[PDB]
Every structure is written in structure tokens, then in C-alpha cells.
């Protein structure tokens, strides 16, 4: 019986936040336009999808 | 035992600021969208990466 986790996180130097930065600059630099969401909104969406 | 430096800088006519202008108009004119950072933010990022 398990709980899905993003890993431990205490600050922006966490691997989930560095991954949020990496995936947000991948997605934002592939989509023409001004986004309305930040990197943390995209990673929280990406965990809710999990 | 050395200290890495951007060169001497007293105003915007400095070579680090002219280089900031040059690299910022290279990066901004290759990326579709409205940036949120200025030229000085990009050059300070580019020195922190060094």
C-alpha cells in the first residue's frame, strides 16, 4: 500500500523544483505565446495527472 | 589564486554592458515571445554560470 511522492522538497534546490524548471522551459520554448501559468503550476498539474 | 572578473565597469559604455546588449538582442531575436528579463539579468545569469 503506497503513497506517490514527488520526492522530498524543502526549497527551490529540490529535484522536483529543478525538474519543474527544466520541463517548464521545455514547454514554454515550444509554445508560441505568453503563458499565464508559472513553472510550479505546470509541475503541480503534472503530479495531479499522475 | 585568481578571481574571475567581467572586466572593469563604470557605466553602460563598458564592454560587459555592450556585450550584454549584443547577447540579449541575439537571444531575444531568436526566441518567440515576450521576455520578462532585461539584458542585465541575462548577463548576470551568464556570469553566475561561469
Swiss-Prot record, chains A, B:
Organism: Human picobirnavirus (strain Human/Thailand/Hy005102/-) (PBV)
Summary of the function given for this chain in its UniProt record: The capsid protein self-assembles to form an icosahedral capsid with a T=2 symmetry made of 120 subunits.
Source superkingdom: Viruses
Modification after translation (UniProt): The 7 kDa polypeptide is acetylated.
Subunit structure: Homodimer.
Name this protein carries in UniProt: Capsid protein precursor
Disulfide bonds: none
Remarks, miscellaneous: Picobirnavirus particles are capable of disrupting biological membranes in vitro.
